[PDB]
């Protein structure tokens with residue numbers, strides 16, 4: 001039984017960040033990883049998605065070439081070219097992460113970890129036992145797929161994981177889901193030339209975002225050539241002579257349901273949710289609490305119900321983002337190894353960017369949320385909608401929408417929501433201001449930068 | 462003698478902003494404009510420059526097309542196409558501004574204003590007299606050109622004004638100056654295909670910016686194909702059989718001077734400075750103080766030395782930016798018409814973006830300036846340099862450099878300097894944070910947005 005100061009199960013965003021900071025603080029740490037280091041973000045998430053987004057962005061920009069004075073660009077996108085380069089880049093990152101661990105003196109234990117029946121919390125990997133007074137579970141999640149029992153032929157569809165394995169651009173693609181992953185995948189497939197449909201259960205995507213954003217985003221998708229199938233769900237999938245045939249039920253409220261077949265589908269992509277990866281951990285041998293989806297339950301300090309067992313990141317089911325896993329893992333290392341007892345992540349005011357076309361940035365409360373926290377009488381919003389100057393000379397157009405949610409007489413800025421060209425890079429510093437408690441006077445008293453889209457946020461009236 | 466509550470001389474950025482706010486406050490105002498409304502920014506500045514930058518940006522992006530999986534884009538940029546569209550857009554703005562004035566009930570007096578010999582400050586426009594207890598001079602500036610006496614044939618060169626009149630892309634262009642305007646013009650001409658040289662008196666451009674930026678910017682220019690002629694100045698210009706011939710002196714320190722002729726020059730562009738437009742105002746009839754360049758001198762509240770005469774914007778010679786003229790004109794209207802005596806613009810922490818390739822964003826003190834304000838022992842900087850993920854798959858590369866200047870033990874953020882893709886839209890919100898007095902802990906405690914360039918600023922170590 002090898003003993004360490006800190007054992008980290010999972011070498012993804014949160015596990016690596018926590019292990020590294022712990023080691024800086026003098027901990028003797030080991031990371032257990034059964035697949036590739038870098039976890040979901042590097043291998044099948046953030047990174048490869050962003051490369052594909054940059055690619056889709058080129059496709060759009062190329063539509064405006066002629067408007068800008070240049071000769072019309074003619075063609076066909078070659079999927080394999082970028083796929084090969086994308087894979088190589090991921091390989092480069094994997095090697096870097098590994099080196100980061102080695103330079104820090106963190107041991108990498110390769111294999112699948114499971115808790116043992118032993119009294120003091122102990123794990124087993126490949127027959128060998130390992131123990132530590134502090135064990136972090138950061139095993140992340142996985143894409144959720146429907147059961148063949150509820151949707152027959154569901155297994156003919158792929159998930160976001162399968163998207164990263166594709167080697168050719170699918171001719172006809174149907175994406176099921178209305179969350180950010182669904183939205184991003186649809187936007188990439190469509191821009192690159194797949195005839196794409198997005199199938200949602202209601203009438204708008206991103207229903208948990210501020211309603212200005214969910215409305216605007218749904219419109220932008222339509223405008224970009226994505227067919228949004230509203231109030232629709234899949235009833236069955238079947239393998240035909242030439243691709244797939246999707247049976248769907250459309251049930252507009254106030255109307256009779258109608259069943260439609262979607263033929264000649266090359267790619268059916270389930271983007272319906274994520275499930276936590278806890279199933280094969282033997283949690284129950286320690287009685288560690290989970291919810292009914294399998295999420296590990298923790299307190300504000302990332303503690304599980306068992307002393308010396310912590311959990312961070314996706315496996316916890318809250319705020320499923322790489323930077324949150326990182327920040328939570330770092331704060332936890334400071335608490336454990338630097339004895340900063342008050343060290344923990346504040347889950348409010350976490351900023352998010354959705355890589356749609358144009359991209360979306362949001363931080364803080366939606367208008368409704370502020371309304372429920374402070375009362376209608378105490379909430380005031382400011383918004384603007386305009387066509388960015390980029391489009392002044394183009395036939396193709398996109399819009400930029402921005403909304404600021406203020407509370408109390410002081411007009412404290414409690415939410416910023418926007419969609420538009422440049423919004424992916426614009427959000428970070430306003431997130432800093434929001435975190436600091438800025439009021440609207442603070443924004444207004446900041447001299448604008450002209451001509452930019454960002455200046456609109458400091459000139460709202 | 463027609464009397465108003467407020468007379469504004471000049472209908473550009475600051476004059477229009479001030480007149481509009483005054484009118485909201487109940488003032489009966491009139492704007493005197495001898496040319497086009499919108500002034501320098503709209504007609505020959507910010508706006509047309511940005512359109513040309515977006516055009517240059519397309520040119521670059523088109524170099525990466527093939528790397529991204531698409532077929533090589535082949536050609537020749539057509540200057541007149543975009544020129545025509547750019548001019549139309551400016552025409553659209555002129556009409557909008559005019560309408561803005563009318564909707565506000567502001568009178569537009571068309572013509573050139575000059576002060577009169579009259580005791581109570583009075584102006585004359587086209588034979589008629591106008592007076593007000595509050596008169597704002599916001600006449601802006603103009604490009605500076607050398608005297609034929611010092612540089613013979615200087616008048617064969619054009620200025621940034623002339624740049625906006627060009628109808629064809631010059632084959633060979635030489636730009637003289639090392640300030641932002643010079644840098645921007647060179648970057649646009651070069652990206653669009655002119656064989657471009659930038660002639661600077663020292664070894665770096667943007668010498669008043671943080672030295673990380675002046676170094677990086679000079680390198681990026683070289684890397685983008687701009688020939689930077691260091692320690693060089695023009696000695697004479699002459700009209701040859703086929704364009705211009707520029708005689709220059711290069712005087713590297715530690716070396717002997719060497720004279721070179723530059724032949725076959727299509728376009729010689731002077732970007733050496735701006736001069737205030739005060740010369741034809743008859744200021745001296747009121748004894749209004751100017752400095753030796755012709756700038757009107759004002760106090761912190763924009764007052765001139767004469768009661769009821771104010772000046773804002775470029776004519777004052779400080780912080781030559783549209784948003785500063787706007788903010789100063791607005792604060793002044795609140796002071797005059799809302800009786801807010803403490804109403805004035807804080808000239809610290811004004812953010813700037815330079816539309817180079819990649820763009821530059823800066824706010825606050827350079828490292829040297831912090832060093833002189835606080836002492837070397839009290840200044841600590843943080844910086845990073847990296848290749849944006851956009852280039853992971855391209856043969857062409859650009860870099861991103863960021864620097865944070867902190868002061869005192871608390872590490873108050875007193876300066877942010879950066880250059881890189883996306884930096885034009887990234888700056889605004891950090892400018893808000895800087896204005897509010899953020900410290901480095903405030904940045905560090907803000908959860909990152911991944912994957913973006915902006916996240917680097919909140920993860921500096």
Ligand SMILES: Cc1cc2nc3c(=O)[nH]c(=O)nc-3n(C[C@H](O)[C@H](O)[C@H](O)COP(=O)(O)OP(=O)(O)OC[C@H]3O[C@@H](n4cnc5c(N)ncnc54)[C@H](O)[C@@H]3O)c2cc1C
Nearest residue numbers: 010012013014034039040045113139140313314320321322
């Ligand atoms: C398509 C997609 C796009 C995304 N885009 C973004 C984005 O742009 N920005 C963003 O912020 N977030 C994005 N996310 C979310 C981000 O990827 C996750 O929030 C993040 O990866 C969660 O980190 P984690 O540390 O919890 O887990 P993970 O990164 O998943 O890592 C868990 C690791 O544990 C390993 N493991 C699991 N069980 C065991 C075991 N028993 N023994 C040993 N090893 C084990 C796994 O192999 C894995 O490497 C995206 C996600 C997806 C799916």
Ligand SMILES: Cc1cc2nc3c(=O)[nH]c(=O)nc-3n(C[C@H](O)[C@H](O)[C@H](O)COP(=O)(O)OP(=O)(O)OC[C@H]3O[C@@H](n4cnc5c(N)ncnc54)[C@H](O)[C@@H]3O)c2cc1C
Nearest residue numbers: 471473474475495500501506574600601774775781782783
């Ligand atoms: C090439 C270039 C690019 C620039 N790019 C940017 C940029 O991207 N961002 C930025 O913030 N700033 C930029 N600037 C600077 C910005 O244009 C100026 O700071 C801004 O225009 C100054 O406003 P102003 O109100 O002082 O004067 P102006 O806008 O110049 O207006 C002065 C007005 O007064 C009129 N006038 C003058 N004298 C009289 C008289 N006697 N009677 C009647 N009317 C009169 C003039 O015709 C004019 O319309 C740029 C400038 C240039 C030259």
